[model samples]
Target: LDFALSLLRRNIRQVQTDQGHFTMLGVRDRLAILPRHSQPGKTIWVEHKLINVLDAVELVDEQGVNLELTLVTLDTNEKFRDVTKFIPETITGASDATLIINTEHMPSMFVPVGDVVQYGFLNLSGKPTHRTMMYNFPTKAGQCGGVVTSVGKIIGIHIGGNGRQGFCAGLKRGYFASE
Candidate 1:
């Protein structure tokens, strides 16, 4: 189990944009990609959203950089072949679960799931439409990270931070298979 945990810790990587830092969470795809929460009409370089497909392509061509995985919004059917995907699942047994949040400067920190807060924010507009679960974890702005169990099971991906609380959405297990 320690070896497995070591592998998971080694898998952690920092995701960034020209504007600043984004959340650094592991991707479920075959390649080493990461997912960060994004929104339409939002600033891509500064904000946490993925850049548009056209812009992404331009970035790839002009800057010689590219997103290895695609970003597919299940609800909106928005797909980008060169970016990360937005596949979310429900996280069970989250409360009281001591999970490790792998970061860049801090390396990693074991954040005990204090409480699962209802997603009541400006992004959703209203109503808990999706299974977006926000938990109490000590995090900072632009610190996108991955939450893994002590046994090295990745349960969720940290998207954003609100004061001492951090937001995470579970990863669809089928997309992230490991043995």
Candidate 2:
């Protein structure tokens, strides 16, 4: 286990931002994150190679103050057009997972997967925790990586690492279920 963690951590990259260290994952510009991954608000801060936040849409529910904002951004990087995205449903199993992250002016790296604890879907809205899964990988502070399959299928964006493991916020099914 220690060997795997050490090998995987080497590929992880540090994201620069005042909010916190984080990463974005998805097919092309259609990236997603957990609302809780950032400070609670309508606007979320994200700096990545592919997407930039131009504006946002706040999805609020009467159930409580829990807010989920959908990011609307302008595509500025032409280099990311050819990158492939993992099917959201492929995140369901625990076969072989990998983490891909970007470094400052450095090439992106791939890491190993951690134990995926089966949990309910993270619904910040009134929908409640539906049937779903969350990918919790091993990580450290100042590190944000992508959770993907061994073959390069994206699972979600890894934000912060707590204790010995970390969690990833997946892209919503309704948004990219078909593709």
Candidate 3:
């Protein structure tokens, strides 16, 4: 996995605007391997939240942009309990529980998880059918939901790619910054 990740890092370069913002071409080189589940029966979801947003721009392309967007991050720290149902029973990437979101805006689906999260739980009530389950963390916690694009100066983040395991999303800024 380290080798594959390194290769992906090597090949994926950003295309920044003259003014300093990013445009990404998909990672060109890498192989992802995962564990196979014998009985996979669940659905999970990931939510994208704006971590940081840049000033907005008008795309002059023929298709004329409809929904304005901004830079976003996988808010993996809020509401983890609600999204655990989507985690693939077996996979190498996310463990315990995850939050999933459509970052690429393409046809995407998967449960996303945070690096520090672990464990899931369930409780039974009135009847066996009244059982409920919950994960340990929230995917959106601490995520700085950015101001909506129209409400303020903001750049739109785009969601991209889906594969056998999960999908991917990216930031809208010129360089990667951490919280």
Candidate 4:
């Protein structure tokens, strides 16, 4: 059933981004919408490279609701390199994906998502529970920041599994009202 598994990573736009290393979520020009990977004033990491936020702003709705997302401009001292430059395997293993279960578990082992089921799951870590969009798929622990994709394009971020499925959310309409 697993045919040339490395092919899964081939369709990835930029391994770093397509892998949803939390590289760049939503962006306009040089600015990007980011995750809560760090505090208000902090640095983001792309491997050994550290990208400092030139200007970081918290986002909210027109009515002043917390989007819990950030928008920032990056200042990098070194030139950025795409993942392909560092590896040749992904190129030869190229394959296409309509939908994939991309997460921290190991995107290299891309699993096709056949059905898209939506629902809200509980916070099974036993922490306070919250309702959110979720779908049926075999999930793993510590994949909270994972992203779901349709045809190798990002659609949502994972909150991790409360069961065998994943409960997640991301870049929804009007989150920042920035198109």
Candidate 5:
């Protein structure tokens, strides 16, 4: 396993948003995407950081399709995560994959150490509007925002798990800010 994508977790950090003061972690880049979890007028912040949010927006689009990715902006002078050395948004099919996260503190003990259990089709061109992928990985709370990686590339974000299956939301440049 390359773990190149997993290594990107170095840019990962806990962020707190005023949206009910809910706290979650996010991958930082030009802007940290919420990976689905909020509303507007909320400021995304970190208690231990010297930064301020320029504000953030939800992942929903014009047709009201929830993309499950939130774009977060910070004060102009403020820097972004490690010059944004994140994994590029390349397509990784149903292959051996892993969720990048501190399993000890993020996922349940039930989460088995494994590889891509299966595969499915996705439509980035739109229409069905589905981006969910089923995985055998054990995903629980704290795992929702984890990276859905496959073959050393980022495929999506862990949403949650039920039974032996977990779900994820695919990544697309269209879902990013300033696209």
Candidate 6:
């Protein structure tokens, strides 16, 4: 999710200030709240992104304190393109993301995974482990792990000398984590 973080972090400064009570030049004892991606689907949910410090207090209250704010993106520069002449048929598949997984054992047969150029992921089966989750994509009959999303999230990278094998073999997994 580093890429998602990077995408959000670039415009973090642009978030709107709602509960603005500037005491210090740097705005001490303040919070910058924003909305970040919950996961990566239509059904995914979202939560507040908070940065807090020494601020006001609601003493002798049952509910304690309540502060609400919002943050949004200012600018973004993300794009992807396909070059048939430059990329090979084997690696490029019928189109781009064709052979994103090209290893010796696998022969780089699968294309990229994204349904769209930069905003979609293959719907592969997930195998959750203690530390990681293994993804199964659709490819040839012999090939179990398959496909790649173009300009997609990097959940797994092909391993071995010739990109033969893959584990957690999906391109991306989207989720939200907070307190």
Give the candidate number with the greatest lDDT.
5
- Candidate 3 — which residues are off by over 4 angstroms? 27-93, 96-179
lDDT of each: 0.41, 0.43, 0.21, 0.41, 0.51, 0.23
Candidate topping TM-score: 5
Cα lDDT tens digits, model 3, 1-179, are 33223322332122222222222222111111110110111211222222221122221113442212222222223311121122232222223322222223311222323232111111111111111122233323111111101111111122211122212121233222222
In each prediction, how many residue pairs overlap at the backbone (N, C-alpha, C within less than 3 A)? 6, 0, 28, 1, 0, 17
lDDT of 5 by residue, 1-179 (tens): 44543344444445444442222334444466555554424454554453555656666546776656666776645444442223445433456666665333442112323554333333333423345667775565666556655554556666545656676666654455355
- List candidate 6 stretches off by more than 4 Å: 1-99, 110-137, 140-149, 158-179
Residue 143 C-alpha lDDT in model 2: 44
Determine which window of 10 residues in candidate 5 has minimal summed lDDT: 104-113
The TM-score values for the models, in the order shown, are 0.50, 0.54, 0.19, 0.51, 0.65, 0.20
Over 4 Å off, model 5: 1-6, 18-29, 38-41, 76-78, 81-92, 102-104, 107-129
TM-score of 2: 0.54
lDDT of 2 by residue, 1-179 (tens): 34224323432333434455444332345333333434323333334433454543343335553233333333345322323433454335455666565545333555666555445445423434333334555565444444444444444555444455655544334443323
TM-score of 6: 0.20
Worst 10 contiguous positions by lDDT, candidate 1: 53-62
Ordering by TM-score: 5, 2, 4, 1, 6, 3
Residue 155 alpha-carbon offset, candidate 1, angstroms: 1.3
Better of 2 and 5 by lDDT: 5
Judge candidate 1 against the unseen true structure and give its global Cα lDDT, from 0 to 1: 0.41
Give the C-alpha miss distance for residue 137 in model 3, angstroms. Answer: 11
Q: Relative to the unseen true structure, what is the C-alpha lDDT of residue 30 in candidate 2, on a scale of 0 to 100?
A: 36
lDDT of 6 by residue, 118-163 (tens): 2112222331121112223343322222222234333322211113
